Design a protein around this ligand. Sequence first.
Ligand SMILES: Nc1nc2c(ncn2[C@@H]2O[C@H](COP(=O)(O)OP(=O)(O)NP(=O)(O)O)[C@@H](O)[C@H]2O)c(=O)[nH]1
Ligand SMILES: Nc1nc2c(ncn2[C@@H]2O[C@H](COP(=O)(O)OP(=O)(O)NP(=O)(O)O)[C@@H](O)[C@H]2O)c(=O)[nH]1
Lengths: 315, 323
Amino acid sequence: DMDTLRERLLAGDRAALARAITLAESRRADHRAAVRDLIDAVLPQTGRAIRVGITGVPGVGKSTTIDALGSLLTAAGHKVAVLAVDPSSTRTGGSILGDKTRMARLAIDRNAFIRPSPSSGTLGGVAAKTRETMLLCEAAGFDVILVETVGVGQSETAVADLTDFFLVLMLPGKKGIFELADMIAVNKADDGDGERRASAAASEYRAALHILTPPSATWTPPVVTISGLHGKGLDSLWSRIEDHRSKLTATGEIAGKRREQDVKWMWALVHERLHQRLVGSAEVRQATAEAERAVAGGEHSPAAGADAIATLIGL
Amino acid sequence: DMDTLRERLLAGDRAALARAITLAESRRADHRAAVRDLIDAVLPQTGRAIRVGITGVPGVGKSTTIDALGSLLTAAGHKVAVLAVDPSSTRTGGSILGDKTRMARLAIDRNAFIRPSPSSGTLGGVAAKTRETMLLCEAAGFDVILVETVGVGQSETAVADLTDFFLVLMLPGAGDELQGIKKGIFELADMIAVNKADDGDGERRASAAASEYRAALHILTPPSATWTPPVVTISGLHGKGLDSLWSRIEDHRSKLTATGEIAGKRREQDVKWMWALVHERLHQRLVGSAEVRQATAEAERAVAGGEHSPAAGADAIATLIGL
Ligand SMILES: Nc1nc2c(ncn2[C@@H]2O[C@H](COP(=O)(O)OP(=O)(O)NP(=O)(O)O)[C@@H](O)[C@H]2O)c(=O)[nH]1
Ligand SMILES: Nc1nc2c(ncn2[C@@H]2O[C@H](COP(=O)(O)OP(=O)(O)NP(=O)(O)O)[C@@H](O)[C@H]2O)c(=O)[nH]1
């Protein structure tokens, strides 16, 4: 019953939230429709959260840093969602149980809620389904939404376009990442000597970033040092994110960014549906893959590809 | 007469080139269809050119630098096309004459060929049209294709994705007067050229700016890349730095041709323009009548206004199409 699902979701019921999400992430069109009204209906309870995107190479203490940061926040009374975006999920069907235990503490904290990357046809669709899932979390009372890049593909721009603040975690020992960053945090600044060489590296990143013009005069990206493993610097790291929130709330820039992202996700969903017509049948898929291949092979022009494809999919 | 038009264009007939371009860039579907087979037919004669994207804030000296650079190139026997991408041409009908006071020499040099930005429903569509225009030029025998950003809008990615090499022009001045690299431009840039480095005080301030940019880039550029983006100083107005600027561009082409990276990048740009065009058709369908544009805009307004969800907007949109 969707009325009950809604009410219990609004009441903060973890099982109702998990179930609404399942339907919103579904690759069945009938399921997705079913919960469109529900998300729309609870939209006025969304948005009262800090959305942070977090990235860094595999091997930088990302999951560790998240487990620790998230635990600090649940201890102080926050309810924290951790959602993944993984471009490989455009080729897998998604994951039933995901990989919760990379974050040992959060994985068992009922003040947390951890979800793996949804499946969809395009990266745009994966990210858009993630926005819808963020809205459900918020409506169920999660006030911190962490969205992390997982895998090796290009998810950084999408994660940044899903959140208010984009956090880059770096080691002390992809170009585009720097200009997405609202803050860099040099990790593994261990009390024993790691602090010296991460403080060095932070001066290098801090020096270089002076040459980039930030998108707003309201905020100048800082570079900091932390230890994710021993919990160092995590409190001040969070206080900078809070400070960003207060400043860009006062100027209306948090809201203006979100409005722009939302329209972007709307168009991404329109384009996902179009893409779904490419796999409408084997014949349509064959012919459209060969149009694309022709263009990618240099054999016919982009415009000829485009018209072949447009005819095939009824456009 | 398309058959002669083709043969004339392949022979380097400039009037034929102008004519095919006006069809390719047309906002009339019947027109665009007409020349589709022609471009497809001349494809094996395209690609033998160096394609350079050029950007910079208004006032930095872009038209001046292109005028001086293109002229050097034409004196050496190159045929030089200068095309534009203007994001505001999604809101205009495009320009008929374009702006050429700025390129006084090239505007009369019959070894050059200058075109204003085409008009389309979406920025992707404008840029896609510029790609087809680049192909027609190449087929007519142009071996240097310069593509510039126009105005202050967000067209840099589009130009970067239309060319082999992306050149950023910057103002001189360091310390508190350092211009700063606009959000997005750092990752696109294959070289920075600090312009207005005029004999005397210009060159001092430009050299200062340069070392600043140069050190930052060293820090931020991963070492894997076959190419390390240089920073250089030039004066577009007084001709300084231009042979050196271009020698670096040729070095890029030689290196990345060896590793197959020029051809690999083009093939992914091409697929991207193919999809842009697919999405421009979709968009056209959403402006096909007053009632539908109204409904579309209302849907988008609902999402931007925080009144309805993105997926609910997209569902309303999708109905209006029959999708
Ligand atoms: N010395 C030190 N080691 C750390 C720190 N944070 C993480 N590590 C270590 O780095 C290794 C990789 O950690 P992990 O957090 O899984 O990195 P990740 O690959 O980015 N996480 P994910 O599972 O999402 O990919 C682990 O063995 C972990 O103990 C730190 O602050 N200091
Ligand atoms: N002193 C000096 N002035 C220059 C140089 N290059 C261009 N200028 C001057 O700066 C002004 C702007 O030059 P212009 O080429 O029109 O700049 P633009 O970047 O093409 N502007 P827009 O993007 O709006 O078309 C002109 O007065 C021009 O003479 C230079 O190397 N030195």
